[PDB]
């Protein structure tokens, strides 16, 4: 089948969503340094190196350890942690539950993934009263109580750490994890963050092909607006603020590449190229066999807004060494 | 473009998800009675009558009314409600917030449960990291006498807490925020076939219907969803599971919203694929309204996709010709 149909004008003017946060795509994010991504990322051979299906599944892990730290009574912090490779009930990969985010855990100034869930053991002594609570989710070493972010999956850990004090009944040392699929971003301090996850925070499995720059052609991510985690509320009115989240593909591209054979239409070293026409100016975007998108931004790391986009037109197959026009 | 690519073997062997619950598609659900659907439903002309984008958005409504009933001893039930038409920050439609489910509020029927909050800046309850379960749906009679509604004209959308608290919420008007994931409440988890039943689906004015046409009956896509219960939120699915249905694979909805299909099918035509099983095959068809059809007649038995071998396109054909059903 032809790759041409994988980008259309609606994908970039309101109907698209990034494959990491599921947020409406409103901008392109050049990455001149390059990056890698495998989770919920598909290539043109119909395969993924990640642990997630091309949907935003809820997170369920049957067995990790639970550790608790608290000096008083209302600040007891819960840390659930499992070795990678223990998500045995995930047909895609036992690296981590389907839907677990591919981001480093926050250790002791970057953005972290927050979701709402629970740590549960049938033998425990807590009663359910209809609530779930916010956790920081990520990959790590040193859990519990010496957490350091990790960005690889062999011999590392996945962590869920409660943001607020939890309630009494936390007896058991092992427990299951359940987290609703929606992710919001925790950031703090007076420092600014451009977007989350930064390339040095993205978790990949071994063999994951990287997206390295090729001349002035650099990989690009898709940016949307995501809620910030804060202490005013969970998310109503987005009053805790917003930031930009990024993903490697529009989820519509991920899904179609998992559903349909595109393996003949692209060789290594080739882009499928589209033209993005703006009011004044246009740029070309390319897709390579590994499922990564590219832009001709050279060193420019700044966001490209899609708010004035007129249309997307297919161009065709081009060598990846040919400069993608970048005339904005 | 041709509709042939909109169904492939992976869609029905693990990678498909229904457009209502986002559950992995494991079965086909014949609907002899027929049904309608508009929310997160797209047609081959690239348009929807619903209020939702082809994604599973979190739910956000800037102003409804909150009321409270309860003695005081962890008994206070919170009911939030707004008229349809007040979701004015939804560019798709002001009927209801993007992501609000198209199901009647519960008054052996399954209902939609999500985890969320009712928030007013002046409320006295401080935030400590939790959201709670609400039953969500369209209704009339809120707040005191909630009853399921199936249209958007003159009706309400409601969120009603399942568990009681004490005091802390007092402001009469407040915003609703609910996380996108829906689980299913049902007091008869043995007698609930699938959720929603055709008579529970909420549709907007103009929404085309899917009625039977000969032995051809409309079909829904079914997947396993978590039941809401009082053991926990969802860890291990220990509260049980149910069948949820949607009118389309989300991959189909999505592609119909992104790509022009408006010249590839006339009214009265199906695009037809063949589904091959061990010891039989059947045909599935898709009409220009975006509904799928099967030739199962008055049979409402669920067709399991466990033993599916492959999907192969067949081509355009009139909707009066019988979709073969040799299983």
């Amino acid at each position, epitope marked *: 089948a032809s790759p041409a149909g994988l980008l259309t004008t609606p994908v970039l003017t309101g109907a698209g969503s990034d494959n990491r946060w599921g947020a409406q795509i409103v901008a392109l994010q050049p990455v001149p340094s390059g990056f890698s991504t495998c989770n919920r990322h598909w290539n043109l051979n119909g395969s993924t190196f990640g642990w997630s299906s091309p949907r935003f599944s809820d997170i369920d892990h049957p067995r990790g350890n639970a550790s608790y730290t608290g000096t008083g009574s209302t600040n007891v912090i819960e840390t659930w942690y499992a070795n990678t490779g223990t998500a045995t009930n995930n047909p895609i990969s036992n690296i981590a539950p389907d839907g677990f985010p591919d981001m480093g855990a926050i250790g002791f100034p970057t953005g972290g993934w927050v979701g709402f869930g629970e740590v549960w053991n049938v033998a425990n002594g807590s009663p359910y009263n209809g609530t779930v609570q916010a956790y920081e989710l990520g990959f790590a070493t040193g859990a519990p109580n010496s957490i350091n972010p990790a960005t690889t999956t062999v011999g590392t850990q996945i962590v869920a750490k409660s943001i607020y004090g939890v309630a009494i009944g936390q007896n058991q040392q092992t427990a299951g994890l359940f987290v609703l699929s929606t992710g919001i971003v925790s950031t703090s301090g007076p420092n600014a963050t451009t977007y989350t996850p930064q390339p040095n925070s993205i978790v990949v499995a071994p063999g994951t092909p990287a997206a390295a720059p090729i001349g002035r052609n650099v990989p690009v991510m898709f940016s949307g607006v995501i809620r910030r985690a804060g202490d005013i509320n969970a998310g109503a009115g987005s009053v805790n603020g917003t930031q930009y989240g990024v993903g490697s593909q529009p989820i519509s591209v991920t899904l179609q590449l998992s559903l349909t054979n595109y393996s003949s239409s692209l060789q290594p070293g080739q882009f499928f190229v589209w033209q993005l026409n703006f009011a004044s100016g246009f740029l070309e975007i390319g897709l390579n066999v590994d499922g990564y998108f590219y832009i001709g931004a050279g060193a420019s790391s700044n966001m490209i807004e899609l708010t004035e986009l007129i249309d997307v037109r297919p161009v065709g197959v081009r060598p990846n060494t040919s400069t993608l026009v970048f005339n904005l | 473009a041709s509709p042939a690519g909109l169904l492939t073997t992976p869609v029905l062997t693990g990678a498909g998800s229904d457009n209502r619950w986002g559950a992995q598609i494991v079965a086909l659900q014949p609907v002899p009675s027929g049904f309608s659907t508009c929310n997160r439903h797209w047609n081959l002309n690239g348009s929807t009558f619903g209020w939702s984008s082809p994604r599973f958005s979190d739910i956000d409504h800037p102003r409804g009314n909150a009321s409270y009933t309860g003695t005081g001893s962890t008994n206070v039930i919170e009911t939030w409600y707004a008229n349809t038409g007040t979701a004015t920050n939804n560019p798709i439609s002001n009927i209801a917030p993007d992501g609000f489910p198209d199901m009647g509020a519960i008054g052996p029927t399954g209902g939609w449960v999500g985890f969320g909050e009712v928030w007013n800046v002046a409320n006295g309850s401080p935030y400590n990291g939790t959201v709670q379960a609400y039953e969500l749906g369209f209704a009339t009679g809120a707040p005191n006498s909630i009853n399921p509604a199936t249209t958007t004209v003159g009706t309400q959308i409601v969120a009603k807490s399942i568990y009681g608290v004490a005091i802390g919420q007092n402001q009469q008007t407040a915003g609703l925020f609910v996380l996108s994931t829906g689980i299913v409440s049902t007091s008869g988890p043995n007698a609930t076939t699938y959720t929603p039943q055709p008579n529970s689906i909420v549709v907007a004015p103009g929404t085309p219907a899917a009625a039977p046409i000969g032995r051809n009956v409309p079909v829904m896509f079914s997947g396993v969803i978590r039941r809401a219960g009082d053991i926990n939120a969802g860890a291990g699915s220990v509260n049980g599971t149910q069948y949820g249905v949607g009118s389309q694979p989300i991959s189909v909805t999505l592609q119909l919203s992104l790509t022009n299909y408006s010249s590839s099918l006339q009214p009265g035509q199906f695009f037809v694929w063949q589904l091959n099983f061990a010891s039989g095959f059947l045909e599935i068809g898709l009409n220009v309204d975006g509904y799928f059809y099967i030739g199962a007649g008055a049979s409402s038995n669920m067709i399991e996709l466990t*033993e599916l071998i*492959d999907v192969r396109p067949v081509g355009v054909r009139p909707n009066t010709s019988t979709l073969v059903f040799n299983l």
Partner: nanobody
Amino acid sequence: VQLQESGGGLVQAGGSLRLSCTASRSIFTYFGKAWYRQAPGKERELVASITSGDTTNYADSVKGRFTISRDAAKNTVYLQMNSLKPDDTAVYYCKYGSYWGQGTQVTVS
């Protein structure tokens, strides 16, 4: 990603061979896996297919004698060929999703 085919060679009639096909990385795909074969003076033909739901399917000439299976942890699909006949002499090709291998020769004497 590359495929490694092994387990072919010479066998006498009624004998048995186990073909193996291993991808070189831990990838996941919803596309089916399959074995094809091509005999001299004949067209390549589908022998055995398996879906991501583990649903198998077989050509008439091999139904009952051949069995396809997989080991996800090993990134491997197998073809168990029993009661081999000279009709089964062919180059056998593995299709691991969209990937193809170079093919392994099977000779039944």
